[model samples]
Target chain A: TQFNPVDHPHRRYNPLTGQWILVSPHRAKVLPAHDPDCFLCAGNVRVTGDKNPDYTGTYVFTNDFAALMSDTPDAPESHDPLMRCQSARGTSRVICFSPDHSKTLPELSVAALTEIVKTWQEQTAELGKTYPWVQVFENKGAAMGCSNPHPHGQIWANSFLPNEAEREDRLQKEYFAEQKSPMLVDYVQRELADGSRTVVETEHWLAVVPYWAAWPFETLLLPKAHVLRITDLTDAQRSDLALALKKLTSRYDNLFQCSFPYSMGWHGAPFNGEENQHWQLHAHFYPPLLRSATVRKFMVGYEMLAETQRDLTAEQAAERLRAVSDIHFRES
Target chain B: TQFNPVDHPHRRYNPLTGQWILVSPHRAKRPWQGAVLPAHDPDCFLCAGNVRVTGDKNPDYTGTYVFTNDFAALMSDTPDAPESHDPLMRCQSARGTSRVICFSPDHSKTLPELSVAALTEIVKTWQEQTAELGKTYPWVQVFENKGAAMGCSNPHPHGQIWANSFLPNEAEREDRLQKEYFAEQKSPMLVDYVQRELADGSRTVVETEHWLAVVPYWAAWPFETLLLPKAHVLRITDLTDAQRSDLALALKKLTSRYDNLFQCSFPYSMGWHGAPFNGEENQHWQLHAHFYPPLLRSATVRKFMVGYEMLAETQRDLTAEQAAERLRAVSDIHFRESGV
Candidate 1:
């Protein structure tokens, strides 16, 4: 029998982590603009009594209630291997994309998005000096658990490598050693050749609904060339990436005729002062929207206990993304 | 400087998965439950229908019932696909089946409210289901997503059984670790761990002659507990008749304490782990269950596993010992029974 991803349930293997995601195609089935009460407004006062400076462009501030700290001291060790623990030192900060609370990432222009990308590069460059990994993530919409409706993102720099980054690092290194090519760089070429999963493609950058997407509309944004880190992107590449993000995110909003909610982040080579030719700079966008604006997907049961599963195939999602207009729906 | 877990930030390593979890005890100092539904709704699909017979059969109002899930996630008739050596994308046809086990015909009755005898029948049903599925599939997973927060769309109390041709991510990791531990110690991994937890009763919530329930050392959720047997049992079907009755009692007490703590229906994703159906005597394997409750402070404000958790690792604020103590302090008799 023929395996039709649009109808049949199949498992997609993730080579990076050696895991499988069950795509059950048979079961193929957010929120406010802004408010004065939002703490992220230009001149609004936060709950901690810290008033904003009314900045126009962008704002960066340390999280009032941080998940990690910079002054964490060493702790005693346990003899039992199961109860092992160590000290973790890190810093968590928030980055406001615009002082305007109404506009989201998709509503922003390429010029403004470029500036945000530049800010991300600068943050990574500075944090990479002391920390091994710098994680920049944006939890857009209240559906994805954004505390504030204001357009913002977050960055957490730690002295240790995270679980996701560590797995990718090892897998990519092994792939490059065996095949003599960067994993993601080769992947971008293959995806462009296939073209089924390609959502948006520019000269230097491309975005695609990855084959092993665990979410309905999950995508991967990567450079066409071998770029090891976000800081390594050329000026031309950065502008193209800004356009890529603009087009991709615009398509996302246009998909369900509502604000697309997702948890997106950047993954690059850890800047621990070692050569990382095997590493490739990439961004992952995992959206939770499935069928409509009110409906959303949640990982539970088999997914939580066993493995990740989804209904819509990545090819189908890519087609839907491609069918949407790049122009912002609100702007239209 | 001293490292007080109650006020310090630390990373705990999980031996089973070989992963790390961030525990920020400093931010531990953090609504209400959702709308209450009526005891039973006529529109409910799981409720007993007035006419209970047709081509599409309707179960009569009686004991626990089992049925093939209409929207099953797996298929037993999946055809084999070609294997690929590509490292970027790889896949193989995973063939299996899925079943749904309705705990009670009464839509309002939760697992905690079920009598010991009725709960024992549910346990027996789970074992029988696992044994039947294990005959064909290599992996059989029994899990239940309780409450709407845990993604249970239906109000009815039910659980799912999914049998697959291959070991999933969590099962693979556990299988490897258990095999490795047995290779070194010449004994099952969980057996030794349960013994240790019994000796250190600080983390143990319910301990009977046959079973023990304790919050594990590397708990990622706020109130995660690991339910295990005192003796070496590789699978749920391996339990004796005496063990089944005791198991039901422990489950009742454990879930009742959970509901009593929040004073509402606790939301959690619970699943059982048993030995695979590989044709060898899996002496390295041990049967156990895991309860991962999402509620952090109240029933409304849940512990969101997002951002850093999705990218870095699982993070929690509350300690396991503190969570166990809170669970232990709650009454075993459900709050719904005692008149307010």
Candidate 2:
């Protein structure tokens, strides 16, 4: 069995982390695209009765085939933290951004994309009423193994906030207690003051590729105010959010003319009834694309399958994202 | 544009306790198997270098990639208590088995078609490691995930053992309660449970299935299971040498059947965490295996990706009994299966 020489520098070295990703770029280039079977295409009717409208702006819908059903039996015993293996109950929804199926956030019209922001707030409030945690996210493109090409995002409302959320909650809560201030608010102020890491900003929100970003092109969205959850935002804040979202996503689309793929989610205060004075609402956008549309960063082998993560500084990623044009080529 | 029926039912609903998963099984399936780029498989080396000379017996190895794990997770961390993550941390050398099997070329391999002997060797090795780990480690975890789809990235045919400083959380909880029940009635927990399951038999997916692969009554995954060693064997090492051989044969049959069932490489993370090695006899700790496969509706729709899984408690769309009966009806012979 002769080894292929092209596969030799097989290691994808992260100069910053001193780690490597098993680069099978060639493997990705030759891959076929089986789009016919994709379930999320524009014309397809989902499991739910609502027919997706072919209108141009960002569209929102509940996932037709949701893994977390709305009608799960109440888990009275799931509250105990010690029993980590309790019944999981939650709701799953999908937010479609375009009728084109191939379009991403950056490609949509500002007014069109604002509707997505409105839908996100509406769904967050509605779902947050029942579940303790609501995660609004999007898994775009086949390259991210999204399995669907529809221009859409998803909302998952669960009983317990996940590990990353919990960590953020704890950190934010502690910071709030110490400073009597919102964690992200303070963090954003610091970042804006620093200026180097800021990608895009609006009167109501700041989008910065954080210092500790785990992936290339990773960005964190923070409300400029002390808002702790999506539902807490005022109309003005929501409009600003729309602006920030459009700007951030536009930069992403402009980076690669192709539909830029990523897995992004919103993290807010947990559903614990007490006023979450310590919680700081935020969102994280983790894009797997490395150099090009086809090229991706894999967490296999050492980085993911092994220990914790290793990656370039968030500043480097922010610089690259900042350098990219925000104008959509189609609009041009 | 004409509205397609497949996209109608896509609504997100919130439940009380767990996270939600976006299931768009109706989404378009891309036909992409790019150029055939072969890489190192994780199994070849483990079977060759680790198995004992007797060919009948499997030997153990040391270090990270060694065939059989020497020090496992559940070893006696001393003064074991019934519960407490504190006790969990204390039992560093708990009695159990942990090994990393290097698959083929640092890549993945399906178990069914590996030569019967090689498969047999894996079986013997697992049994040997289990017994060895169980003697001191208490509980042993023998499981593997084939691809990144299932969260096993090394593609190594290898699995890991975390013989605890104490009995694992699930097994410990089950043991404590079962032992109390057994003490009151002088009966085994699983022995009675298995008989009932076998009697109703609705959840029994495979029979000459060697190890009965049943969708456990409390299934967590879409296709979760409680594989019982047909006989009442307390530990993997305790199996009669022949039983070990039988166990090996059973795994190949079960996995091959899975690969054929999906028609693609079946993705799952399975392991057995049983008993504790506290130098005390634990008759209540029943030996069982849990096989959590990610497939939901089809080969591409895996169950454990982030959304609901990360946010909420573990949830499943299919009931355990339904899963068992469905799997039971499926042919064990890979060639005979339809979908794959």
Candidate 3:
């Protein structure tokens, strides 16, 4: 940063993967619209050729086209490690956030969101019995190839840990062995102390555009408590998180006013059937909307092959995120 | 896979990155032609006899043309960048030379549009240029980003070669994995994997005497594929004349199949991976090409590399077998050539 920070070429280190992302702030320049005839709408289960129970509160259903299942038999063996194959047994369930046809996560009230968290807790608890790795993720907007725009998220519980979860596990375990504390606990405190990248902070949670984020508008969601899983959270913390998410996601919506498109997911301590002290609970909000809703910031040539890159610097994205009002656009 | 592997969930290993791709092959259930390109555009710089923005001009007599990139991303002569103190703020001088190669004399001629002779000539250029470029720069990446959606600057059926000082993240990972596997098994990793894919045959797209192309078992993209040699080939320079010709035909078959996939000049990010000639025996390195197509369904519809793909690993709905079936079902001839 000493060499006229924004002017020159630079690479930022991604601690998680031990990779570097090229960030040429000088190259700052570069938007997608959605498919309107949606299937994920409230009453459009008929159109989607899927069955839906007529219940009101946050709904859960087995994915019609699930990527995994619990009864999957073992695939044939290749003794060579280079060509390893393992039968993955798991479950994938889709959770709809609301009965409203047109609503995103930010649009939901804290009370509504609390119900969602309660459902997440229940799902995580139930799924944890069968599989150690439980992943909860949401793909918002048609921009991110989320075919349906019905503010729904998914839970994928599996026999094996995801590549990302595995990497995070290694990093955190190594970090805790050295420092004798959860990695993110110290990291979030430092982020709060630094305050440059912090976008929104409350009594319980904090959201900040991480320094090494690959995307333009990438934010890390952290809670103040040492909650390693959704099941670990107290009722008070759950309600606090509901309010925190409402504010954080609302600020995201207010960033561009229009329904912002993003892929968000909660990362929990993987149940490796061990007493794991290294894991920390956090969520990642990766929004793809670059310049506007109509236009898209694509990960094309260089980003695809070479490495992750962005013209919009992390500090710059953070400033923009912090500048946006907390009030939802529709309210004002 | 004998016992309905498709019905059961499976995780395929990618030896290169130690990554696993979750595959539920049975879940495979699943078009607009967007390329409204003409056979020629006078404004196209790569076209024969056209004046380029760089103030240079393409030769009037030409089947294929090569020129330095007018607006290069990396300059060869940039001074060494200042190092960072924070360790986290690591910065390096991204030194590289970029060049553009025209696949054909015709402006609108894509890979499928070009005759086999012309395509072979382009392959020869790649081989010769890679050898020469490898002499100066250890890491050379020859690739093409096709279609407007893929952020191709021009739709003139041209590809680029970037020779840089450092090995990219992908090539680095591949290099490490190859070397590590060779050390343990005393054999190349991809070579073994290619044999397994050939044996499986479910994901095979095209098979020739010297070359094989297949939708890799660990494919993250909907229709992602890998083209590799049947035997050991370290770099493009190692290819024999027969191997080169076989590769050219293989390329023709693959690209034509791609065109037939969506009935349009298919959009994809394709590139070659070789051992960086940075002075090692490099017996571990195996030459291969990766074809990562973004098109999910129609020409208008495409898969975006965002969200979970960016933060985590990739997730795909369609299985590689289903994808290969779709490609294999398509006519081998170009859609434009076949009166379909």
Candidate 4:
């Protein structure tokens, strides 16, 4: 084959990390398997011995086996001081996506998804009150190590900034220093102009298989307006975002007519209590499903060994995402 | 549990990448169901007789055999630039070669099953390939993803190399760290680290005349190891024949001990890191290898790098020293040989 991206393997540069993601978009046509006896079901008692409130909408609770806690006492600087050893302090909580025990992200109603989005915004605002960084993320399906089968996400507020969040903060600030505008602000403009990678574009939001996507079905979500954080979404933009989110995940679920498993997180300005004009708000959706539920896109061999290596081009992944049905597969 | 690293969650700093690894050493006691397997297989594509997907037949070779990867990852003559106009975006041509080197013709043989002579041949092949690839590409990576746990599709005793013009992330990180440290201290950092760890002995698993494999203090994986040479050898090509022989012995002892630890074929992503072949002085650089294993407690259970690990930093359930102690306790002799 010629040196064409669609045919041969190519590397995509991640501007955020200045790293690369191997784009073997050729391996992107993944399909999923069936459902579960979910721990996150509406009335199920979690390992913490606490029964969830049989609420009508999304429910939130502290993780029984939380990895981080708010009361972790600071440890004396030990080992090589240059190593910068510090005890992680924060909170880890689970927010069930819906009351319906069997439904997934895309399976939920638009009204339910809108409310879920509102909960996400509410959780972000609430957690940001105390912590420096609030990571609103989701781990869906078993393939992605989301042991539970319920439609749910997590909120982890940390005292110290995570390595990835810290890196992106610096990247965004650096990009802003150069261009005098938010990095993602410039991003949507180019994505709109490029036109090839847009999976779905709404009036307020745009979703695309980013040019530097690491996973086969990875998507980057951006707000067209200067919405610096989840809490800052304008009322109209919020509805648009909710609609875009539903449509996006619906098309994803409809990709192979299965519940798509992904680990996605939203990025916003740090809660250091500063006017964060340098950092732009955005979200990254890393879906690991490659060919099917069992057959996933693994970063092993050359990828884990050397660098990211892939066969399918980013353009190809976008075209496939665009081609996927918008109506939920069950509805269709 | 006041300041005990094993009792609570602490962030382990990785100096190489300037990253962090969350350590939850309390989870070390998780159980494993164990695994059992046959001693030999006939249908393996990497076996002495089976044919591969490309219609290429495997010869009845004895020691070590080298062949091109059936589905190569990178191309040799790819366009080195992208057509897009965005300067913020960058895409370089991944021009290089990929080849698979089979350690043994047997399907069921792990590293411990292979003889020292076979392992020596494997190392020799690595030297030859790295030397050739080094002449053209700057980043020449030789890695082995062993066992199904590590995503090695087959149980054949083989490893692979994917060389490209760009230096990989780890290689580049180490190169920068070494160059900067040496520029300041006027000595090789790894050589210094080797001397210190030799005296410490707590982390050291095995040591021969030339090679030392130890669980690095900043180990992110459950049983991560840093294999370094005693001498200031810049790359595999710089190793003397005696050093190479000693390395084979050291690896045999280490890998045997690894399989013995889990009582199964231990799964790991092991690879060498060295100075880039960028036609520059590498006085500051020293060659080393990193072994990132998957299993945490037993055979079936693995330290999944999900949730906080994927979102923030790499994490492990066991401390480097604890893992080292476990590996050191394992028998270096062949386990199946005990029954014999």
lDDT of 2 by residue, B1-340 (tens): 2222232112221111122222222332334242122333224334434333334223333222344443221123222223323200111111223456643322334566455566666666666666676655554556665566755534446666544333433444555676775676576666666776677787776555336666665555667666777666666656676766666677766776566556666777676645556766778656666676767566776554443333323344455555665566556656423334
Candidate 3 or 1, higher DockQ: 1
Model 3 Cα displacement at B242 (Å)?
A: 3.7
Q: Any idea what lDDT model 2 has?
A: 0.57
Q: DockQ (Cα-based) per candidate?
A: 0.71, 0.07, 0.41, 0.46
What tens-digit string does per-residue lDDT give for candidate 3 at B93-151? 56677788888877777887777788889889998889888998888888888987786
Candidate 1 per-residue lDDT over residues B189-265, each given as its tens digit? 88998989999898988988899999888888889999999999999999999999999999999999899888899
Best by DockQ: 1
Candidate 4 structure quality by residue, lDDT tens digits, A1-332: 44656655566678787787654433433212222334666566666666766677889888776777777766677665224467877878889887776777777777888888899899889989999898888877776666666678899888888888888888888888888988788888888888888998998899988888877878999898777788888878887887888888988887877888888888888898876887777888888776665666667766666777656667777888889788788877
lDDT of 1 by residue, A1-332 (tens): 88766677778888667788987777765434445677887777888999988776778889988888888887786755556787788888899998767888888888999999998998899888989999999888888767677889999998788889889899998989999999889999999999999999999998999989888899999999999999999999999899999899999999999899998999999987777999999999988888898787888778878999887888889999999999899887
In angstroms, the error of model 1 at A304 is 1.0
Task: After superposing candidate 3 on the true structure, give the runs of residues whose Cα lies further than 4 Å from its correct spot.
Answer: A1-5, A29-57, A76-78, B1-3, B29-36, B45-61, B66-71, B77-93, B132-136, B197-200, B298-313
TM-score of 3: 0.89
Better of 2 and 3 by DockQ: 3
- The candidate scoring highest on TM-score is 1
| Candidate 1 clashing pairs, residues 3+ apart or interchain | none
What level of docking quality does candidate 4 show?
Answer: acceptable
Worst 10 residues of 3 chain B by lDDT: B27-36
**In candidate 2, residue B314 scores what lDDT?**
39
User: lDDT per residue, candidate 4, B1-340, as tens digits?
Assistant: 3776667667877666677776655556565444544544666777776687777888888777788887666667766555664546666555677899888766667777777887787889999999998888998999998877766678778889878877776677778877887887788888888888899888889888888999987887778888999999998988999998888888888888888887877889889888889999989888988888887767877777766656665656677878898888877876865653
Candidate 3 residue A35 Cα shift, in angstroms, is 16
